[PDB]
Design a protein around this ligand. Structure first.
Ligand SMILES: [K+]
Ligand SMILES: [K+]
Ligand SMILES: [K+]
Ligand SMILES: [Mg+2]
Ligand SMILES: [Mg+2]
Ligand SMILES: [Mg+2]
Ligand SMILES: [Mg+2]
Ligand SMILES: [Mg+2]
Lengths: 122, 77, 200, 118
RNA sequence: GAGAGUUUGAUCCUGGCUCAGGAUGAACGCUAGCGAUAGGCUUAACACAUGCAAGUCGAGGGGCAGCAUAUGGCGACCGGCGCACGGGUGCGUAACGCGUAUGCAACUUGCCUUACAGAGGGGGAUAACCCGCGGACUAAAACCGCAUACACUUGUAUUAUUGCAUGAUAUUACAAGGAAAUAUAGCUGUAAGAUAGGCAUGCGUCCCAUUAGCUUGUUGGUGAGGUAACGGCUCACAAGGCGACGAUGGGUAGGGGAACUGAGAGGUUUAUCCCCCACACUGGUACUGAGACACGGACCAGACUCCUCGGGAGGCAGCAGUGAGGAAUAUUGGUCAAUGGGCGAGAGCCUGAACCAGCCAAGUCGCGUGAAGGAAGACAGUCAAGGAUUGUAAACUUCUUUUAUACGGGAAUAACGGGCGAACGAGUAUUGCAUUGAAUGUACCGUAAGAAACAGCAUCGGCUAACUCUGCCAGCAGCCAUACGGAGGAUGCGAGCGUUAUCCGGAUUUAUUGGGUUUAAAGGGUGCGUAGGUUGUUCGGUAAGUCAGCGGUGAACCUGAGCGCUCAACGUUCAGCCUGCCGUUGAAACUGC
């Protein structure tokens, strides 16, 4: 544009959006599991992923992926939800923090223990 | 705590009495017509206003304003 | 913190016996682990820069945060960045003690400094990272001038040939003349690689 | 009223004071009209830096010093009536010569012998 | 001042996205030794119990319950000063509120300093005490007259000087009017100073035009009243004022310096720190006072809550408990020893300010978890031999740091009481005074003893093979095994290491510096034309833009040099930044007139 055009109007800047908006800028949130179900990945991936419908304290519905081998989650279980989205799964943009509140650590883990909330073996 | 309440109330009554007296005197003087009579009652009212300003019920500038206005009126009858 | 691990592993990994002279470096010139001496896979230029940085760090007993701060100091200072970095590394109190020969190894010098057997300008200084300036006097503490280890280390060190260090055996002390040039410093560290790695 | 006092400005365990001229209602380390010196009580000689002319001017216009500020001013020699003399002139107090009084008191040094003959 | 990947069978572009880097008052998972120095309800101006946070003066007065025979002192009462500060919070507010620069010939200012004058007489109440809620008595530096102030205020006149219009200042007055405190340090009037406020201005100060007209004390005048003060501030002719250079309305927000970030331009936020503003359960009204949004004041009206049948209380945005909410943030701690503050003649009293201690992976810095010798044990992995490995076990020195004992500073300098030059101020010499505190530091016992984990290892990327096998992993290319799980090794880092959240840079992805529009997104269907933007050549003025000189103004943090923390973070001093704003002098090439 011309200098006169920019004087008249100017430039416009647009703020970005959060990748995980249901956290409300909190690093984690507390929630209650509505339904703990199993889902299918996209076309090039075949598995049975474990997902949970979680009602956060700020009255928001989220789909949170439960990581690790096996879980003890059921309905009406208090869990901690953090950010992070799985690629093949569509609409699942949150993770359950293992080893906190109701959800326990992954049993039998020896490597990457801190990512799955597993205590150091004796 | 009641000491402050009592002192404030006593001082409020004390200030109100003298302030009302001065205001009534000013109002009565403002309605006079006889020049000689006005000149005879001007000094006492000036004394009252100046004593009030000294006692700090009113401000010295306020007393000066009132005295100036009343002297101007007494000049113009 | 300190490395306090095995030393022959690092010596064999880097080839050069940076921790002095050892009998293990012969008949074993491979990096540790079961995958050693299996040819030599092509390591990238970044890998070479990283290995040079690690060689300097293991040589002088400096951890990564302190090393980065030393690089920042060299960058702020006036002169060649790499030469200044090597001068700052050699100006540490434990390195100065080791060059004076009071202790056999740099780790021994650090242990003596930490355990307060070294005095700087007549006062006890026990910080191994203390930066020695030219004109200062570093000597054995008077209460520990008859230590068996110190006496053994000084036995046979009658040379004291370092040009930038003046040794006085009568006072059991030494002084630093000036900051030596990088070519005078006897270390095989290529400071240029560390400089580009830390600046890129 | 206007005052001469010290603001604590060092760190924990090491107090350093800034000698300022401030209104009495101001916060201790807050607003100040002017800065006239500094005070380090950690050193045994009790280090003092002061602007003599400005301190004398503030005393003249009537700033009231605190106890320690008054002691500092007396030590520096601001508190004098040499200017108050109405019957004399050029009355050189020369008390700075006696106020020098250099206290070069040191401590003897002793050493422990190392009898490690083994 | 530098990155990488990703659309294709392959290529060059355009374009978004995702990862690398730095930072946090962060949280979470695993793990955890110390010291120093920072920080600690980011969610609601949420709710509760207890305690403290502002008192002091017996050199003001009547007195004397707690002691010596009213005198030590002191409960209560009258009285003086203070509680408007220190401290807390960010609701409201788009405004002369804030920043920057000024003006007041339209202003006020307790305590403090200096100078000039003066402190003469008198009167009446009512607290407490006493007698019953009502009555009686009495004192003051409480309150109020009279006298004197011609330094003050008001009115008039004269003279002189002068400014920026209203005007200002200084001699001359005559006239009227206005004060005081005493006790063992003080009081009153006036002027100047200092300090602190107030008012008014130039410029700058967020989005929405899917907000275009707004305004009737509203714009100006005359007069009056009122105020510390000018003024529609208020009250009794004219029709004006503000508006696309954005009025009005709606939404959102306390504002700066800092801080962070980037080569810079710039961007983000005002957590801790400093300045200004606003507020104190919600509204309204004032009183007292030098000063009031009255933060530990009052009255009224609301709502909420508590304790009691007549009613009475509270406000947690002061400091500590607790509860709730939340991912999440600590002791119902010590001391007034230091600094500051209030009161007091002083000694002194008070101080949840402050200085400290306690708790908290805890932001940053520093240190340790041993040093030098020791051959290829046992057990784990791979293939008889590599590797873990000089690693272990042995033997010899050291004790930073833990443990036990002892010496133990500095932070504290004035005090008060004695003097000495003399007429009050200072100048000297002494006593006592440390929460932290067995904390710094120092020294001796005998001891390797008490002290390492976390994340990677197919490429980008630094690191490898065996055993398992949908379970999974995952930033991308993708992998169901150099990618999943375990084992052995190796690689980063290291008392930390990873994950998530948020912000900035590369990102030129709003491009003034510094992008584009034939076909990638992007020329209005085409003209005329209002506001606006731009303006051939030449001469002469002006000085708005522009250029130059001089002057004023602009804590902490940040940059070279030191100094002190054993080093370092940090603290502190000094040189180098002021590179904005304002005032005043010049220049005339260019733009404007
Ligand atoms: K007052
Ligand atoms: K105190
Ligand atoms: K032209
Ligand atoms: Mg009188
Ligand atoms: Mg008043
Ligand atoms: Mg560290
Ligand atoms: Mg197109
Ligand atoms: Mg066309």
């Amino acid at each position: 544009p011309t200098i006169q055009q920019l004087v008249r109007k100017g430039r416009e800047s647009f703020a970005d959006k959060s990748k995980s908006p249901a956290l409300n800028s909190c690093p984690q949130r507390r929630g209650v599991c509505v339904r703990v179900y199993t889902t299918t990945p996209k076309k090039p991936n075949s598995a049975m992923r474990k997902v949970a419908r979680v009602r956060l304290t700020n009255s928001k519905e989220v789909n949170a992926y439960i990581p690790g081998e096996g879980h003890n989650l059921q309905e009406h279980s208090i869990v901690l939800v953090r950010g992070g989205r799985v690629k093949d799964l569509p609409g699942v943009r949150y993770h359950i923090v293992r080893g906190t509140l109701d959800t326990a650590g992954v049993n039998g883990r020896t490597q990457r223990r801190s990512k799955y909330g597993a205590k150091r073996p004796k | 705590s009641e000491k402050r309440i009592r002192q404030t109330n006593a001082r409020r009554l004390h200030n109100r009495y003298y302030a009302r007296t001065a205001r009534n005197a000013v109002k009565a003087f403002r309605a006079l017509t006889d020049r000689t009579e006005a000149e005879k009652k001007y000094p006492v009212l000036a004394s009252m206003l100046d004593r009030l300003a000294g006692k700090n019920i009113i401000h010295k500038n306020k007393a000066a304003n009132l005295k100036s206005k009343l002297a101007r009126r007494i000049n113009t009858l | 913190a300190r490395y306090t691990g095995p030393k022959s592993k690092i010596a064999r990994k880097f080839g050069d016996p940076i921790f002095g002279a050892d009998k293990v470096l012969s008949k074993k010139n491979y990096p540790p682990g079961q995958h050693g001496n299996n040819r030599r896979r092509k390591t990238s230029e970044y890998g070479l820069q990283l290995r040079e940085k690690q060689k300097a760090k293991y040589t002088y007993g400096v951890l990564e945060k302190q090393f980065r701060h030393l690089f920042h100091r060299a960058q702020r200072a006036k002169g060649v960045t790499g030469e200044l970095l090597i001068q700052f590394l050699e100006a540490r109190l434990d390195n100065v003690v080791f060059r004076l020969g009071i202790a056999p190894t740099r780790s021994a010098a650090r242990q003596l400094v930490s355990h307060r057997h070294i005095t700087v300008d007549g006062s006890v200084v026990n910080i191994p990272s203390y930066s020695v300036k030219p004109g200062q006097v570093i000597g054995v503490r008077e209460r520990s001038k008859s230590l068996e280890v110190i006496a053994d280390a000084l036995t046979g060190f009658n040379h004291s040939k370092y040009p930038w260090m003046e040794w006085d055996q009568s006072s059991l002390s030494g002084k630093l003349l000036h900051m030596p040039d990088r070519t005078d410093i006897p270390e095989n560290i290529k400071e240029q690689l560390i400089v580009e790695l830390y600046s890129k | 009223a206007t005052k001469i006092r010290l603001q604590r400005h060092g760190r924990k365990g090491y107090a350093f004071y800034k000698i300022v001229v401030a209104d009495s209602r101001a916060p201790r380390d807050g607003k100040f009209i002017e800065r006239i010196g500094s005070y380090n009580p950690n050193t045994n000689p009790a280090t003092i830096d002061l602007n003599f002319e400005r301190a004398l001017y503030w005393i003249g216009v009537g700033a009231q010093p605190t106890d320690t500020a008054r002691n500092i001013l007396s030590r520096e020699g601001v508190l004098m009536m040499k200017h108050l003399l109405g019957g004399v002139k050029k009355g050189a107090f020369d008390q700075a010569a006696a106020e020098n009084k250099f206290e070069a008191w040191l401590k003897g040094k002793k050493d422990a012998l190392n009898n490690m003959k083994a």
